[PDB]
Amino acid sequence: ELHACKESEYHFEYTACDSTGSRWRVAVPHSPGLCTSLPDPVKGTECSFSCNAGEFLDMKDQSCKPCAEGRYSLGTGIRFDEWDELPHGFASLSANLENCTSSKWVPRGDYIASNTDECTATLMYAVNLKQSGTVNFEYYYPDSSIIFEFFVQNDQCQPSRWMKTTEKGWEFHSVELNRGNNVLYWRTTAFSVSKPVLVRNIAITGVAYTSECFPCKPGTYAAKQGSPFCKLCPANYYSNKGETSCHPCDADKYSEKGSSTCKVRPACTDKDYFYTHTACDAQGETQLMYKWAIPKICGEDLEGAVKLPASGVKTRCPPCNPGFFKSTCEPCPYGSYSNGSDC
Amino acid sequence: ELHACKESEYHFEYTACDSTGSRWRVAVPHSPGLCTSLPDPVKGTECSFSCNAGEFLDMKDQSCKPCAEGRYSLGTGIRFDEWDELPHGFASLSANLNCTSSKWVPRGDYIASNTDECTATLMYAVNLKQSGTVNFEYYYPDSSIIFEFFVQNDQCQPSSRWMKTTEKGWEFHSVELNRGNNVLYWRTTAFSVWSSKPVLVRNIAITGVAYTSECFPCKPGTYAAKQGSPFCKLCPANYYSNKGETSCHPCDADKYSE
Amino acid sequence: ELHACKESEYHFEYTACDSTGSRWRVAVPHSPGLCTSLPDPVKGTECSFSCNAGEFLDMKDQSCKPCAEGRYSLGTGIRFDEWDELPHGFASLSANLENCTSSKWVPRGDYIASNTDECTATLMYAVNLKQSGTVNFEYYYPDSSIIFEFFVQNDQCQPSRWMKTTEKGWEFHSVELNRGNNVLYWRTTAFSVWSSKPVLVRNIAITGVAYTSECFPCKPGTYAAKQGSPFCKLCPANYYSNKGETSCHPCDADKYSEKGSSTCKVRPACTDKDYFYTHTACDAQGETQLMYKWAIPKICGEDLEGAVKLPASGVKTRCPPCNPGFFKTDNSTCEP
Ligand SMILES: *[C@@H]1O[C@H](CO)[C@@H](O)[C@H](O)[C@H]1NC(C)=O
Ligand SMILES: *[C@@H]1O[C@H](CO)[C@@H](O)[C@H](O)[C@H]1NC(C)=O
Ligand SMILES: *[C@@H]1O[C@H](CO)[C@@H](O)[C@H](O)[C@H]1NC(C)=O
Ligand SMILES: [Cu+2]
Ligand SMILES: [Cu+2]
Ligand SMILES: [Cu+2]
C-alpha cells in the first residue's frame, strides 16, 4: 500500500548509544508513514567519531568529508568572535571584593572589555565538553594595574592562574581541559594603586563530537575546502554570504577590511592631507612634499575636494642637528661636538 | 545563522509548469528554516517526461533509473488486479431497462457481470495526462449476454463497441485512449431467454495516467528477479515468499502451498 | 563568475502541490545560472488560494492585491464576450435530427446566433473546474419556435435543462457547477414547421477554473477608474480611448464616436436622409406647426458644405377634424 522511497525520502540517523558504545545507522523516513522497504540497519561508529576542524560527518559513508568551498565547519568546537552583546551561556557576574554592580565585563564591540574600577568582574562560561579538548582565546593585557585570572574549575568543582603581561601584539593563550563539565572563568580586579583588559576569539574545542558546515559570513571568503576559519576579505573588496572570493569594488566606493557592502568615497577634505617637510638638498634647502594618509578613501574627481597642495619649493634649512656636521649631515665621530654648523 | 544545507536535508523538487512547459529543479529543505545556501535551480524536463514501466524518475539526474530487484513500478499507469471489494473510482451503476440488487459483483479474483436482464454499467472516469491505452482480460463464455466496452471522450462525445466471445481461456483486449478525461464503460445486458455465465474481467491496466510513478515493493507471494520488472511474477506452487523478496523460499515437507 | 542577483532577476514561484496540499514559494532566477544565495523557500498557501474578481496574487506577500487602475483581473474565471469567430475550446457541433449540417451556431458578431432552420446545433464547451463555480451568460429568446436547452454534464458524463423565454431585455441566467470536468451544452431545436428568429447568447462567464488570474490591460474603447474592477466600463458616445486608459479622452467636434469606440470617425455631411419630417399639436386657432427635427443619434456637421440644413418649418396650417370621441375646446386642445 505504501511507497518504496528513493534516496530522497529516507535519511540516515544514529540510534541511542548503549552502555558498550555501539550505534546502528538506521534508515528513517523524513515524515512518518511515507515509505516502506527502508535499507537495513548497519553498524555505526563507536559513539566517539569526532570530525576534525573543517569537516562534517557524511551519513551515507561514515567518514569525515572535507566540506565545500566557501564554507567552514569549526570542527568539534565553538567560537565567540562576536561581542555586540553578551553571548548566550556567558554569565557576567560582578561582585564587590571585601557600588561596582554597574561595572562588569562589557561587550564593547568586536572585543569584550574589563571593568577599569576596583571590583571583581567575573565572566563565566559553563560548557560540558563531551571530549577532551582545549580553549584558545586572545587576551590583551595593557597594564599591570588590573590583574587577569583564567582558571577552568573542573567537574568536581575542584580547582599558575594569573596571566602574564602581553606586550605589542594581542598574544595567544591556551590551556587543557578534561571530559568533565568544565566551567571557564574570566575575572579581573583593579588594585586602584585605567587600561581595560580585552578578550577576543574564545575558541573551545571538544564539545559536540560533530559539527555542520556553515556558510561564510558577509565580508569573509574561503578558497580551499575544509577551512576551519573563514578568512577576511582585504581592504577595498566586498563580499556576501557563501562567496568563494572577494569581488573587487568600484573606484568611487571605498571598503574596509571584511566589509559586507561598499561605502561611497567622500570628497577629500582639509583634514585628509597632512603637511610635512623632507630632508635638505645640496644647497641646504629642504623641500616640503605634502602627502595623503595611506587609508586614502576620498576621490579627487568630486567637487569641493581640496587637492594635494602644490609644494616643494626649496627653503633653506636651519642649522643641522647637534653632533651632526654637514648638506647631507653625517654623525660626527665620538670625541667631537657639533652644534649644527661645524664639529 | 543557519548551517549550510547538507546532501541529506535538501530534496529536489520541480516548480509549477508554466504555459510553455518550462520547469525548474529548485532545491527545497525537508522542513522550513533548516538550510541556507541551497543548490541553485536548474532547468528541468518539459512537463512531459515519462518513465516506462519498471522505471522511476531520479531527481538528482533527471533520467529514468531501472528501479531495483523485487520492486514493480507500474510505469505511467494503474492496475486493478485486486477485486475483493469494488475498487475506488469504479461506479457499479445499474439501471433498469426491480433490478437494483443486480450489478457487477466484485468477486475476489475477478469481477463478475449480472446474470439477469438488467443493464449493469461499470464506470471509471479517469483523467489521462498522456495518450495511452486500456488493457484487460475479459472472459465471455456465453453469447446470450452482450459485452460492451466503449470509451467516452473528453467532451462526453461518444466514441468496435461490442466484444467477441472468449473461448479457450481468458483473452486479451486493448483500445487506444486520448488526452482528454476519458470515461470507461463496462456494461452487460442479459437477454431473458429463460437460461447464463457472467462475464469476468481482470487485470484492468490503464496507461498514460499521472505521468511518472514510483516503484513499489512486491506483494506477498510474488517475486521479482531483475531490476526494471513491470510486474512481480507469481511464486511457484509448493513455494512461498514475502514482501520485497528476490526469490521464493522452498516450503516444508509437511506443508503445501498453492 | 556568478554574482548575487538583485531583486530584478529572481521571481517567486510555487512548487508542485503535494498530496497534503503544501507548496514552497521558491525564488527562481529568470535565466539559469546567474546568481546564488537566493531567498530561502517558505511555506505557501494550501493549493487553494483563490483571489476574488479584480485581484491578483502577489508573490512577494501571499495576499490578494486590488490590482492597478485601468486593468482588470477577471478573477478565478474566464469571459467570452468576443464572438467574431468561434472562441477556442467551443465545439459548434451540428447533427441531423432523426442535410442540415450547414446549420450551426454562427458567430454573427458581438453575439452568437442559433440556427433558424430545423436542425440540432449544439454549442459545447469542455472546461475543467479546479474549484466549484458558476456560469453566467446572457441569452436572448425572441420567439418560442426555437427551444433552448442548457444542461451541464458532470465529470462522469452523468447529467431545469429548458430555459425560459426572454422578453424585452437580454435577461440573465446562472447555474451551479461542481469540481469535475464539467461540459456545458447549448443546443437549439426548431420544431416549428413554419417560420425564424435566431437565439442569441452573450457574455458567457465561467468562474472557478485556474484558482488565480493576472491583471489584464483594458481593451481599446474601455476605461477603468477604480482599482480592482472585474470589468472595464465602455466609453460613452463621442468619447474615444486606448489600451490602459484610466479615463475616456473627449473627441473633437468634427468627429463622431460610437459607444466603446477605439478611434473617432469624421462626421459626414448632413443628407436629406438624416432629418425626418413631423407635425406638432394644434394651436389656439386650430392650426398645427410642423417642426422638422434631426434624428436623436444625428451624426453630421452643419458647417460642412453640401449639407442640407434643418428646413425652415412651423407655418400654422389648420388642423383636420379631431379624433373621433374627442371634442376640441376654444384652444383646440382636444380632451377625451
Ligand atoms: C548600589 O548598587 C545598585 C546596583 O547597581 C545601584 O543601582 C545603586 O546606585 C548603588 N548605590 C550607590 C552607588 O550608592
Ligand atoms: C425494488 O427496488 C428496490 C431498490 O430501490 C429493491 O430493494 C427491491 O428489492 C425492489 N423490489 C423487488 C420486488 O425486487
Ligand atoms: C449535406 O452533405 C454534406 C455533408 O454531409 C454537405 O457538404 C452538404 O453541403 C450538405 N447538403 C446541403 C444541401 O447543404
Ligand atoms: Cu527529508
Ligand atoms: Cu567576481
Ligand atoms: Cu531462500
CSV table of N, CA and C and ligand atoms in Angstrom, one decimal, chain A residues 7-11 28-31, chain B residues 8-11 28-31 34, ligand 4:
chain,number,residue,atom,x,y,z
A,7,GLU,N,16.2,7.6,-2.6
A,7,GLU,CA,17.2,8.2,-1.8
A,7,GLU,C,16.7,9.6,-1.3
A,8,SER,N,15.6,10.0,-1.7
A,8,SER,CA,15.2,11.4,-1.4
A,8,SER,C,14.2,11.5,-0.3
A,9,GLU,N,13.7,10.4,0.1
A,9,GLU,CA,12.7,10.3,1.2
A,9,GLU,C,13.2,9.6,2.5
A,10,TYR,N,14.3,8.9,2.5
A,10,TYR,CA,14.9,8.3,3.6
A,10,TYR,C,16.2,8.9,4.1
A,11,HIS,N,16.4,9.2,5.3
A,11,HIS,CA,17.6,9.8,5.8
A,11,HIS,C,18.2,8.9,6.9
A,28,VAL,N,15.7,6.3,8.3
A,28,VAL,CA,14.5,6.8,8.8
A,28,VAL,C,13.8,7.7,7.8
A,29,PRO,N,12.5,7.6,7.5
A,29,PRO,CA,11.8,8.5,6.6
A,29,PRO,C,11.8,9.9,7.1
A,30,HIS,N,11.6,10.8,6.2
A,30,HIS,CA,11.7,12.2,6.6
A,30,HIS,C,10.4,12.6,7.4
A,31,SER,N,9.3,11.9,7.0
A,31,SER,CA,8.0,12.1,7.7
A,31,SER,C,7.3,10.7,7.9
B,8,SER,N,21.7,15.7,2.8
B,8,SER,CA,20.6,14.8,3.3
B,8,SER,C,19.4,15.6,3.7
B,9,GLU,N,19.5,16.9,3.6
B,9,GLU,CA,18.4,17.7,4.1
B,9,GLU,C,17.6,18.3,2.9
B,10,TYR,N,18.3,18.7,1.8
B,10,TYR,CA,17.5,19.3,0.7
B,10,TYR,C,17.0,18.3,-0.2
B,11,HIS,N,15.8,18.4,-0.7
B,11,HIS,CA,15.1,17.4,-1.6
B,11,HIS,C,14.6,18.0,-2.9
B,28,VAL,N,14.8,22.2,-2.2
B,28,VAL,CA,13.9,22.6,-1.0
B,28,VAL,C,14.3,21.8,0.2
B,29,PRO,N,14.5,22.5,1.4
B,29,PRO,CA,14.7,21.8,2.6
B,29,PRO,C,13.4,20.9,3.0
B,30,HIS,N,13.7,19.9,3.8
B,30,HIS,CA,12.6,18.9,4.0
B,30,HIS,C,11.6,19.6,5.0
B,31,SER,N,12.1,20.6,5.7
B,31,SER,CA,11.3,21.4,6.6
B,31,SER,C,11.8,22.8,6.6
B,34,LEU,N,15.6,25.2,8.0
B,34,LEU,CA,16.8,24.4,8.3
B,34,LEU,C,18.0,25.0,7.6
D,4,CU,CU,13.5,14.6,4.3
